[PDB]
Design a protein around this ligand. Sequence first.
Ligand SMILES: [Mg+2]
Length: 150
Amino acid sequence: LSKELLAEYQDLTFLTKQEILLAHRRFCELLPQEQRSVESSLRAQVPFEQILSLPELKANPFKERICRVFSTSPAKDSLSFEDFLDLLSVFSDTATPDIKSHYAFRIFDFDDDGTLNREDLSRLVNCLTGEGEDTRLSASEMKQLIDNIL
Ligand SMILES: [Mg+2]
């Protein structure tokens, strides 16, 4: 489903509390001492440089998409508390795969036109099949199969 499903989650609290505890400390480890107080973390965002610690984003080198797409801020390089938590919630593959699809989709979808564009289409079957590997090789054959399923 579209942001319609997640829209209901964020507007709620599907996010656990324990995970938050870790963020308060575990993360404050990379944040200055004068910021160790979660009090300044609710307004302060996590610098991209430090975010490199979160493997969740490792999915794509230039997470620049996570900042702008996942978060709506001018910096576009500092995960803010706001969504940060909401991310862990929506990132819950509890329900069917549909939820997961939205997770990886929105993240991989930088344009967000309403479907998988050449941009996502690649990064997509790329991670699954494995760009430049055994599966599909260097070529446009990615259209033959993708078109065979559609
Ligand atoms: Mg797209």
